[PDB]
Write an enzyme that holds these catalytic residues in place. Structure first.
Site, PDB file in Angstrom:
ATOM      1  N   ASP A 312       0.897  -1.130  -0.182  1.00 52.91           N
ATOM      2  CA  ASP A 312       0.039   0.128   0.170  1.00 52.91           C
ATOM      3  C   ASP A 312       0.801   1.181  -0.008  1.00 52.91           C
ATOM      4  O   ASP A 312       0.659   2.092  -0.854  1.00 52.91           O
ATOM      5  CB  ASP A 312      -0.807  -0.033   1.234  1.00 52.91           C
ATOM      6  CG  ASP A 312      -2.118  -0.991   1.062  1.00 52.91           C
ATOM      7  OD1 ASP A 312      -2.143  -1.587  -0.076  1.00 52.91           O
ATOM      8  OD2 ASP A 312      -2.939  -1.263   1.919  1.00 52.91           O
ATOM      9  N   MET A 342      -0.318  24.867  14.025  1.00 51.30           N
ATOM     10  CA  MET A 342      -0.371  24.351  12.722  1.00 51.30           C
ATOM     11  C   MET A 342       0.307  25.419  11.839  1.00 51.30           C
ATOM     12  O   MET A 342       1.260  24.738  11.053  1.00 51.30           O
ATOM     13  CB  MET A 342      -1.834  24.180  12.233  1.00 51.30           C
ATOM     14  CG  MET A 342      -2.662  23.390  13.213  1.00 51.30           C
ATOM     15  SD  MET A 342      -2.115  21.508  13.280  1.00 51.30           S
ATOM     16  CE  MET A 342      -2.366  21.173  11.414  1.00 51.30           C
ATOM     17  N   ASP A 361       0.727  36.858   9.881  1.00 50.01           N
ATOM     18  CA  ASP A 361      -0.326  36.795  10.842  1.00 50.01           C
ATOM     19  C   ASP A 361      -0.928  38.267  11.020  1.00 50.01           C
ATOM     20  O   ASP A 361      -0.655  38.997  10.312  1.00 50.01           O
ATOM     21  CB  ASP A 361       0.115  36.247  12.305  1.00 50.01           C
ATOM     22  CG  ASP A 361      -0.953  35.832  13.111  1.00 50.01           C
ATOM     23  OD1 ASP A 361      -1.808  36.422  13.254  1.00 50.01           O
ATOM     24  OD2 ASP A 361      -0.625  34.596  13.655  1.00 50.01           O
ATOM     25  N   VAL A 418      -5.824  29.200   9.585  1.00 55.13           N
ATOM     26  CA  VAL A 418      -6.335  30.252  10.705  1.00 55.13           C
ATOM     27  C   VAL A 418      -7.682  29.121  11.381  1.00 55.13           C
ATOM     28  O   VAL A 418      -7.731  28.341  11.125  1.00 55.13           O
ATOM     29  CB  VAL A 418      -7.092  31.271  10.065  1.00 55.13           C
ATOM     30  CG1 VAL A 418      -6.146  32.351   9.181  1.00 55.13           C
ATOM     31  CG2 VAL A 418      -8.399  30.992   8.964  1.00 55.13           C
ATOM     32  N   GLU A 420     -10.802  27.647  12.811  1.00 54.00           N
ATOM     33  CA  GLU A 420     -11.911  26.858  11.981  1.00 54.00           C
ATOM     34  C   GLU A 420     -13.232  27.837  11.962  1.00 54.00           C
ATOM     35  O   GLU A 420     -13.995  27.904  12.807  1.00 54.00           O
ATOM     36  CB  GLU A 420     -12.141  25.579  12.476  1.00 54.00           C
ATOM     37  CG  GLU A 420     -12.923  24.652  11.417  1.00 54.00           C
ATOM     38  CD  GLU A 420     -11.796  23.942  10.605  1.00 54.00           C
ATOM     39  OE1 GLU A 420     -10.846  24.226  10.489  1.00 54.00           O
ATOM     40  OE2 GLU A 420     -12.476  22.904   9.981  1.00 54.00           O
ATOM     41  N   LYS A 425     -12.227  32.296   6.855  1.00 52.19           N
ATOM     42  CA  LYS A 425     -11.499  32.070   5.842  1.00 52.19           C
ATOM     43  C   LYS A 425     -11.759  32.781   4.475  1.00 52.19           C
ATOM     44  O   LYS A 425     -10.864  33.198   3.682  1.00 52.19           O
ATOM     45  CB  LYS A 425     -11.507  30.672   5.527  1.00 52.19           C
ATOM     46  CG  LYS A 425     -11.071  29.498   6.696  1.00 52.19           C
ATOM     47  CD  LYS A 425     -11.637  28.098   6.609  1.00 52.19           C
ATOM     48  CE  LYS A 425     -10.747  27.472   7.355  1.00 52.19           C
ATOM     49  NZ  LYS A 425     -10.439  27.921   8.773  1.00 52.19           N
ATOM     50  N   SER A 447     -10.054  21.356   8.642  1.00 49.27           N
ATOM     51  CA  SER A 447     -10.385  19.695   8.993  1.00 49.27           C
ATOM     52  C   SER A 447     -11.608  19.024   8.824  1.00 49.27           C
ATOM     53  O   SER A 447     -11.977  17.930   8.639  1.00 49.27           O
ATOM     54  CB  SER A 447      -9.903  19.444  10.574  1.00 49.27           C
ATOM     55  OG  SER A 447     -10.734  20.451  11.633  1.00 49.27           O
ATOM     56  N   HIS A 468      -4.638  19.423   4.457  1.00 43.57           N
ATOM     57  CA  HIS A 468      -5.084  19.153   5.683  1.00 43.57           C
ATOM     58  C   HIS A 468      -3.821  18.565   6.497  1.00 43.57           C
ATOM     59  O   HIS A 468      -3.268  17.414   6.057  1.00 43.57           O
ATOM     60  CB  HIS A 468      -6.235  18.005   6.064  1.00 43.57           C
ATOM     61  CG  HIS A 468      -6.604  17.799   7.266  1.00 43.57           C
ATOM     62  ND1 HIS A 468      -7.166  16.832   7.853  1.00 43.57           N
ATOM     63  CD2 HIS A 468      -6.543  18.784   8.632  1.00 43.57           C
ATOM     64  CE1 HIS A 468      -7.382  16.745   9.016  1.00 43.57           C
ATOM     65  NE2 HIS A 468      -6.909  18.031   9.630  1.00 43.57           N
TER      66      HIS A 468
END
Ligand SMILES: O=S(=O)(O)c1cccnc1
Ligand SMILES: O=S(=O)(O)c1cccnc1
Ligand SMILES: O=S(=O)(O)c1cccnc1
Ligand SMILES: O=S(=O)(O)c1cccnc1
Ligand SMILES: O=S(=O)(O)c1cccnc1
Lengths: 726, 396, 394
Positions: A312, A342, A361, A418, A420, A425, A447, A468
């Site tokens: 795999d 992240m 940022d 950024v 969620e 976004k 996510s 992700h």
């Protein structure tokens, strides 16, 4: 007994010089790598026979390779097909292999291995049979016995010889138990290699030179391994030695502590073969090792791990999910939006590859704190000697923190990380979409939120895509690539190529709520919280997660995920079906999350959850947890708790394989293993179905039977889908 | 058919581990000294009537190897027909030898048997003999071997025994062992050890700390990694093991030996022997081998049902004090009255010489039944690997 | 002295030889576990919770054989944790003493079903590995005049007048009868082949046997430390010189092996659905020259069962040394056609702690194959001991 087992092209080239030194050059003409297959066994058998027949005109032997690597791996396509009825054939095969290496080891003349490249598993076992090991210090070269990572053990003498060389403890912990790979410099440091050379052209000359000096300086001991001399003392003693026998009973308990009681037989068999072999002569030790190897190859776990970590994993790297007919496209400047845990890790793994990163940022202080994540990872890398002072400066210099949208000029690869939220976004993408290159990839580290919705906030929807990552980015190897409805195939291949460039494994997922990793890890945590609502003891729930093979118990993981975020996922899932006029059955875990949120225990970030956190350190379960959920009122068998967590994830993987979310079982297996931590002994959440074993039996039918049994006891969410029936 | 009677039950004093008086004494000498005491008490005993000598020994290696029971028969000048057999059932070896001697007399195929045990832990430490359950990784990994210490701490955790609870029992054992010695209870059963010149080597239990206080016990620190997590993998409903057992509430490592003379009623008549007690019933059982120390409780239940008796029919209970929690759990499970349990102290104060302990506490209850003029006593010991042996004696 | 003890099963492993033996790689704990699994295979519905004790004889309980090998067998085999487990050592007759102790536990009524036998992997744990209270104490070793079994056997041959050809004649007889017993299928159902964790065969026969033995080959062998010869003649002072006639070809072999015997009451057999094969009639124990122990133990067990020599159909004495058997045959006038009719330790080996149970199961089978009534089994012991047992076919 013969040097042959029971047509194939020859693998070994024969060369005897005027001095009498024979050079065996391994060169399998059916591949780019020498492999311990049936062609090698027959080739080495003929070579060894010739060394014995011409012993009176041979003074030394040099084992060499004509490939870029020395010798790598064995015949996985054959080992994965071995049935329990084939245990006699597998035994005879590894006995024939080690009979050839034993003859070569006891010829009465020196044998030197000229290791020009990778010597892994069966490749290192060949070199270990030699009396002297010379390695070329070149880029990419590695040495080790990684048979345990496929659920096997070094059955070609690797266990017996490393124990004779290093003792039981050192060989197990440092070489065998985890299959550690060593660079040529580290290999000599621990005694796995005797000396180094600068280039490959010096190997065979240095090998013949060592033979000439060994015959002259050590004539009596030439071609005699340390464990074949009188007065041989095994390092660390034998099991009968009083010092080793004092700590020897703790070896299986320490192993069971590290594995957390997970059902992986390979480390257990390696430790048993190591100790049992140290109690007898070398030959009897070698035959004991053969029996433990045949025990693993004919087992199911080895088939699961050979399927996942060989077949795999290779299909994925070969571009299985990469769109065919798309060329390479370079990346010059990566722009990361958000300097959280992240976004900082994304900037680090990108700059560590060699890319120029612009870490934006909202404030310069926040972006500087993001780069501090890289600075503190370089500081820990310098203090342990894993990098240089010059490379660390070149790495950090590629990370340019900023707080202005103008600094995103020349950026051709955007990775947003950024908070969620859809509106946030849409906002940060509209600011920078006109400042980046016109062909820039517009990626999102969301996510759960669907990609198709997030792509509407830009004009170039054909280049919007989901990228992700997993925390911590510096240590997690999977990147989940989510393909929106408007995402083009070129954008898919560009993100695919980027994932390999940073050294991570990609999977391709079609757009849906929760994708694949977030959705499947939701069922695992939900099953634990359901059991908590049912009255199962919290300590038993954590034990079931660890003994199932998970890297972190489920209640502990729930705190790291924050129950506040967990509740928002359920509300969005309900609203995503309610606004479609459909039906939504709430999971029993939802009531448990709501009660913990009501109590103010929403996870580790809050400071209190299912565990107590004193000074940012987890310190035992919450004592009030047992009275809140009537813990102890339900005591199911531990295997039921384990199966409930494993089966929930396996059934969810099948759903999102039938729904078209995933396009291959390789992505499902590697995605579950490297993405969310599905136990490796299963081979992946998809391999778990075809490899399940229990009181009923083994296979898909046994899985369906056990799933129906769980459904009758714990709920129709365990009912097997139609696709698993005949 | 035949009833087994106890005619003599003697033991050596128990010498401590560090700088102990018995360290210079070979374990063979300890047994021979007890044999000579039997001769002193019965000078016209026809030793040809003795058919077997059964000695328990947990570490039969070195000074204790090569069938130490046969060595005692030859070294002491007993007839070569007196046999000699060594057995090992971990902590209850001494009691199993006595029960095997009794079952041998009941079968009618043996008439007069010596039984007991010997352990010189200062010369032959426990574990010296090796073993498969620890030195075979394949079977060790499967059976989940855990030392008795963790299992005892796990019992205290599940039952709710605090550090003060186990230390309270440890103080009680010290006080009752001191009262028994100062009261003369042991004057006739403890045979002082002497050298080849008759000089005194030891005449009392060295391990005893008669001035123990609860404040001193509370200052002690509790007793190889991996064993703690392995125990919880099986007892998965327990989050953390509360380690309450120290050197002050666990049994002592000592040297000693014990001898018991067992025979039929006709054997006692032919030799002018007065019976002291009668073996009513014996039993063997067990419980989980990861926690261990729980086999004696169903063995006590088994020996009671077999003899047709209940707890209220027993006057004295004697359980080996390997760990304080094991005794407190045994007391709770069967509702044993406090004034009936280990009335003359135990191994916490006096020591636990593995292979000899079972025969020692057996002889202790024989004397205490006579001193109190009571009827029945129940003797039992916890065993490694999860076993248990129990015996009921009746005063005669 | 009430409950009758019956033999329900009696199996053993093949005996692997000392040098380059097939069983050298097999731990002694696995030899016992293999026999336990065979008992399960023969009685898949047996409630193992009825088994109250496992009694294994082991002369060298150290190393792989330490830590109560019997308890290790109970836990490793997955037997109920209430099945006990005890190791005992009475030198050569440990295997039979375990069976006898199991039988006496059933007679006392305090035990219902017991496993008994022995295990000895001499190629891994050699004889003497446990040390010894006598050898490590010169004061005792000096007073108790110690002489190895080998010299006492030579002394027996000297006193009784057994020549080198007399003892070699018995060694040839044992090799022939052992080969005849294997060819005739006598051991087909009692010798359980040893297999590995994959089911592969390791050993299925007594590889110490030399079925092509001749009188001439035995005569070429040489006889088997200083002082012990003089120490023996200090006790037997009327003997001038010891005739050393014992070699490796007329003495018991060093082998690995194990044996298991299931012993229980009549109630236990009916409750579990087991057919009793034989009944334990009586046991007895009595005894510098050593090996002269089994002669009074045999008279004592015959006197205890109310029998004589003429009442016994088969005599099985362990072939530790050829002279010991020849003296036993002379002292009791044992007919030759009744003595060790299927060979003995000279041909097949003497795995110390397991031998007593091996030769017992040998007689349970031969009594049924011949449809005979009674058999007597006895073993000599070092230090001067001896154990005997009488069984009766059911
Ligand atoms: O089969 S081996 O264990 O030698 C191996 C070699 C290279 C990569 N994975 C596994
Ligand atoms: O026993 S060790 O601590 O060497 C180990 C073994 C297998 C995986 N992790 C650690
Ligand atoms: O099995 S189900 O997931 O359908 C279920 C069962 C009981 C409560 N809520 C959901
Ligand atoms: O460690 S726990 O808190 O799970 C526990 C378990 C049983 C008894 N007392 C405490
Ligand atoms: O000549 S000897 O004194 O060795 C002897 C020979 C035959 C029997 N008894 C003694």
């Amino acid at each position: 007994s013969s040097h042959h087992h029971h047509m194939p092209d020859n693998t070994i080239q024969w060369d005897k010089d005027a001095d009498g030194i024979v050079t065996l050059t391994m060169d399998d003409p059916s591949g780019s790598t020498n492999v311990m297959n049936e062609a090698y066994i027959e080739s080495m058998g003929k070579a060894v026979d010739r060394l014995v027949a011409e012993k009176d005109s041979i003074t030394g032997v040099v084992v060499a390779s004509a490939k870029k690597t020395f010798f790598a791996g064995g015949d996985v396509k054959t080992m994965i097909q071995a049935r329990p009825e084939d245990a006699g054939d597998v035994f005879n095969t590894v006995e024939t292999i080690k009979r050839q290496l034993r003859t070569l080891e006891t010829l009465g003349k020196p044998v030197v291995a000229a290791i020009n490249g990778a010597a892994l598993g069966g490749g290192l076992e060949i070199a270990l049979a030699c009396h002297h090991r010379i390695a070329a210090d070149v880029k990419g070269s590695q040495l080790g016995l990684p048979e345990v990572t496929l659920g096997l053990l070094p059955g070609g003498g690797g266990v017996t010889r490393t124990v004779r060389m290093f003792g039981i403890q050192n060989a197990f912990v440092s070489v065998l138990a985890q299959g550690t790979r060593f660079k040529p410099a580290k290999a000599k440091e621990i005694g796995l290699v005797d000396e180094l050379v600068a280039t490959v052209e010096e190997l065979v000359p240095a090998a013949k030179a060592w033979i000439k000096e060994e015959l002259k300086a050590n004539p009596d001991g030439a071609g005699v391994q340390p464990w074949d001399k009188k007065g041989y003392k095994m390092p660390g003693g034998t099991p009968s030695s009083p010092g080793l026998a004092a700590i020897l009973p703790s070896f299986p308990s320490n192993l069971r502590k590290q594995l957390k009681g997970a059902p992986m037989p390979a480390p257990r068999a390696i430790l048993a073969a190591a100790v049992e072999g140290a109690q007898v002569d070398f030959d009897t030790a070698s035959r004991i090792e053969s029996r433990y190897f045949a025990s693993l190859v004919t087992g199911q776990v080895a088939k699961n791990m050979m399927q996942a970590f060989f077949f795999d994993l290779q299909a994925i790297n070969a571009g299985g999910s990469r769109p065919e007919g798309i060329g390479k496209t370079p990346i010059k400047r990566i722009g990361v939006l958000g300097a959280g845990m992240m976004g900082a890790g994304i900037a680090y793994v990108s700059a560590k590859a060699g890319y120029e990163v612009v870490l934006k940022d909202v404030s310069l202080e926040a972006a500087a704190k993001g780069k501090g994540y890289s600075e503190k990872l370089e500081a820990k890398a310098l203090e342990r000697g894993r990098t240089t002072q010059e490379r660390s400066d070149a790495l950090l210099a590629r990370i340019t923190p900023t707080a202005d949208a103008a600094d995103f000029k020349g950026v051709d690869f955007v990775i947003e990380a950024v908070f969620e939220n859809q509106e946030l976004k849409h906002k940060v993408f509209g600011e920078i979409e006109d400042i980046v290159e016109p062909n820039a990839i517009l990626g999102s580290n969301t996510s759960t939120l669907p990609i198709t919705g997030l792509a509407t906030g830009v004009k170039r929807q054909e280049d919007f895509i989901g990228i992700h990552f997993f925390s911590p980015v510096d240590k997690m190897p999977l990147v989940e690539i989510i393909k929106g409805e408007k995402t083009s195939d070129e954008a898919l291949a560009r993100v695919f190529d980027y994932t390999l460039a940073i050294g991570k494994t990609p999977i391709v997922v079609n757009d849906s709520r929760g994708f694949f990793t977030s959705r499947v890890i939701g069922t695992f945590v939900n099953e634990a919280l359901a059991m908590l609502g049912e009255g199962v003891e919290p300590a038993s729930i954590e034990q079931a997660g660890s003994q199932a093979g998970y890297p972190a118990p489920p209640l502990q993981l729930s705190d790291e995920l924050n129950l506040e975020l967990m509740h928002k996922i359920a509300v969005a899932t309900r609203k995503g079906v309610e606004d479609a006029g459909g039906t939504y059955q709430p999971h029993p875990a939802e009531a448990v999350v709501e009660k913990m949120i009501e109590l103010g225990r929403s996870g580790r970030l809050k400071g209190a959850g299912f565990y107590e956190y004193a000074d940012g350190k987890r310190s035992g379960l919450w004592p009030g947890l047992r009275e809140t959920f009537k813990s102890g009122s339900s005591q199911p068998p531990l295997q039921d708790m384990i199966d409930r967590m494993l089966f929930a994830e396996a059934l969810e993987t099948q759903k999102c394989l039938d729904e078209g979310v995933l396009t291959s079982t390789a992505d499902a297996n590697i995605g579950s293993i490297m993405g969310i931590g599905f136990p490796p002994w299963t081979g992946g959440s998809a391999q778990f179905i075809v490899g399940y074993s229990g009181p009923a039996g083994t296979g898909k039918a046994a899985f369906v039977a056990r799933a129906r049994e769980l459904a009758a006891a714990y709920g129709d969410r365990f009912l097997p889908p139609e696709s698993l029936l005949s | 058919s035949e009833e087994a009677f106890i005619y003599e039950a003697i033991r050596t004093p128990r010498g401590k581990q560090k700088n102990g008086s018995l360290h210079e004494v070979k374990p063979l000498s300890l047994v021979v000294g007890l044999i000579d005491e039997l001769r002193k008490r019965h000078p016209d005993l026809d030793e040809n009537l003795i058919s077997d000598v059964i000695l328990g020994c947990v570490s039969p290696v070195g000074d204790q190897g090569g069938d130490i029971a046969r060595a005692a028969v030859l070294a002491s000048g007993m007839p070569v027909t007196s046999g000699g057999v060594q057995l090992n059932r971990f902590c209850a070896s001494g009691l199993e030898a006595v029960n095997t001697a009794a079952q041998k007399v009941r079968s009618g195929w043996d008439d007069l048997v010596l039984a007991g045990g010997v352990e010189s832990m200062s010369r032959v430490p426990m574990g010296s003999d090796g073993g498969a359950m620890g030195l075979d990784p394949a079977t060790n990994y499967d059976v989940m071997f855990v030392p008795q210490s963790i299992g005892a701490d796990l019992i205290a955790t599940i039952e709710g025994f605090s550090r003060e609870d186990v230390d309270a029992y440890a103080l009680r054992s010290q006080q009752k062992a001191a009262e028994a010695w100062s009261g003369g209870y042991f004057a006739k059963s403890v045979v002082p050890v002497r050298d080849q010149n008759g000089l005194l080597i030891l005449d009392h239990d060295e391990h005893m700390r008669p001035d123990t206080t609860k404040e001193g016990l509370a200052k002690l620190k509790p007793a190889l990694g991996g064993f703690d997590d392995v125990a919880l993998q099986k007892y998965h409903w327990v989050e953390k093991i509360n380690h309450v057992h120290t050197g002050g509430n666990s049994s002592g490592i000592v040297d000693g030996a014990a001898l018991v003379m067992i025979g039929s009623a006709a054997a006692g008549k032919l030799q002018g022997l007065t019976p002291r007690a009668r073996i009513v019933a014996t039993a063997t059982s067990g419980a989980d081998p990861v926690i261990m120390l729980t086999g004696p409780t169903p063995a006590t239940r088994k020996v009671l049902d077999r003899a047709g008796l209940t707890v209220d029919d027993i006057d004295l209970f004697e359980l080996n004090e390997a760990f304080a929690s094991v005794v407190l759990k045994f007391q709770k499970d069967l509702n044993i009255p406090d004034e009936k349990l280990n009335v003359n102290g135990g191994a916490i104060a006096m020591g636990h010489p593995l292979g000899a302990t079972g025969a020692m506490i057996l002889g202790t209850m024989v004397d205490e039944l006579e001193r109190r003029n009571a009827r029945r006593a129940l003797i039992t010991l916890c065993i490694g690997g999860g076993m248990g042996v129990a015996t009921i004696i009746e005063r005669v």
